[PDB]
């Protein structure tokens, strides 16, 4: 009863034909380097090796239109344009390999589904899916932002339909808003979608994910956009995400009280990225602590699935920290400067905006006042004296 890992080198074949390496950030070396890091650190040997598979067209159609699944899930046995790099794609970001991309994208979904079901049924404690292409930007009938099929959303739908799971939490800590995942569950109160993302008043990719997007119909209140606004003045870092987890993510998630937790685990908020791709300064170590916090929910029934994250050192460092956390290893302590740092004013304003909006729906936010400005030490000092 341990941590599972799923990975498949056939996902490396989703690759542009152009030969212009610097042009495509979402490249095969992303998952290849993560897998090598997990192997050489000994973490792979501590985990169960889970074999993936291709998702069926019917499984993909729990989220996407039939036409969308045929266009991107089958090959001829137009929506595709000749790109300036010389390859083919659906937009300037999102390449299409006419031979390999359909199978690779279906394999990414199937890997996530296989791992998610083994955790949900108790064959595994928890797990991490090392998959590409990413999924959370793909809408019902629109690929975008490197994504074709929303692997995490498909897994959640299948949990509902095949295992009758009544409460699913999706946490999305990729630096970008998961517009596809938000769409897929917007009217559904049985799935809580919670995204932390760079929002900057709608001036960052993809442009969605405002705090006042709370859901629709019976789903009102079950969509939580922890949207950071203010730009990179200063960039968000460990203190800001830890405060957001303390004030927003964990109180709401605990009140929701899920049966299963799915994490859209992009690492493009880690320090060392080109600022247009994220520009935040999270440490890899911090993602281990965030993972450990989410492991307290749903009895530990949690799966992380790789989304974005592009700097190889950054995503390998963060994957290592997250898998170490899933295995129950002791994490390195956070630096003293991080524990003592108060979240920056833009993050405080961002957190308080979200709390004001969702105080209408969540009793845990009908708290007395806001503690969003407290450092971790200041918050822990006030917790010990209370209880």
């Amino acid at each position: 009863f341990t941590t599972g890992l799923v990975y498949d080198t056939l996902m490396l074949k989703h690759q542009c034909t152009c030969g212009s390496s610097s042009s495509h950030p979402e490249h095969a070396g992303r998952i290849q380097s993560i897998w090598s890091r997990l192997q050489e650190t000994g973490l792979r040997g501590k985990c169960e090796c889970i074999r993936g598979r291709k998702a069926t067209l019917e499984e993909l159609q729990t989220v996407h239109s039939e036409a969308h699944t045929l266009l991107y899930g089958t090959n001829p046995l137009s929506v595709f344009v000749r790109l300036p790099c010389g390859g083919v794609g659906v937009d300037s970001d999102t390449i299409w390999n006419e031979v390999h991309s359909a199978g690779a994208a279906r394999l990414a979904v199937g890997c996530v589904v296989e791992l998610v079901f083994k955790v949900a049924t108790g064959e595994l404690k928890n797990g991490f899916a090392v998959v590409r292409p990413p999924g959370h930007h793909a809408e019902e009938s629109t690929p975008m932002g490197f994504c074709y099929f929303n692997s995490v959303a498909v897994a959640a739908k299948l949990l509902q339909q095949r295992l009758s799971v009544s409460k699913i939490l999706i946490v999305d800590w990729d630096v970008h808003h998961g517009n596809g995942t938000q769409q897929a569950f917007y009217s559904d109160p049985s799935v809580l979608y919670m995204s932390l993302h760079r929002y900057d008043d709608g001036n960052f990719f993809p442009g969605s994910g405002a705090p006042d997007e709370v859901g629709t119909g019976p789903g009102v209140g079950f969509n939580v956009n922890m949207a950071f606004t203010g730009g990179l003045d200063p960039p968000m870092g460990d203190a800001e995400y830890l405060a957001a987890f303390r004030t927003v993510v964990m109180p709401i998630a605990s009140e929701f009280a899920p049966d299963v937790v799915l994490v859209s685990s992009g690492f493009d908020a880690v320090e060392g990225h080109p600022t247009p791709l994220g520009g935040y300064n999270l440490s890899a170590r911090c993602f281990g602590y965030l993972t450990k916090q989410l492991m307290g929910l749903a009895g530990g029934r949690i799966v992380l699935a790789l989304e974005g994250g592009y700097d190889l050192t950054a995503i390998c460092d963060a994957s290592e920290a997250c898998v170490s956390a899933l295995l129950g290893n002791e994490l390195d302590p956070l630096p003293e400067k991080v524990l003592q740092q108060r979240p920056n004013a833009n993050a405080v304003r961002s957190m308080e905006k979200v709390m004001e909006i969702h105080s209408k729906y969540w009793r845990c936010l009908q708290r007395t006042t806001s503690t969003a400005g407290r450092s971790l030490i200041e918050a822990q000092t006030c917790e010990n004296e209370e209880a």
Partner: peptide, 14 residues
């Protein structure tokens, strides 16, 4: 029309 780019950090618009 449509613009927007994850590589450039530009939101999708119009």
């Amino acid at each position: 029309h449509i613009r927007g780019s994850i590589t450039q950090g530009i939101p999708r618009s119009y």
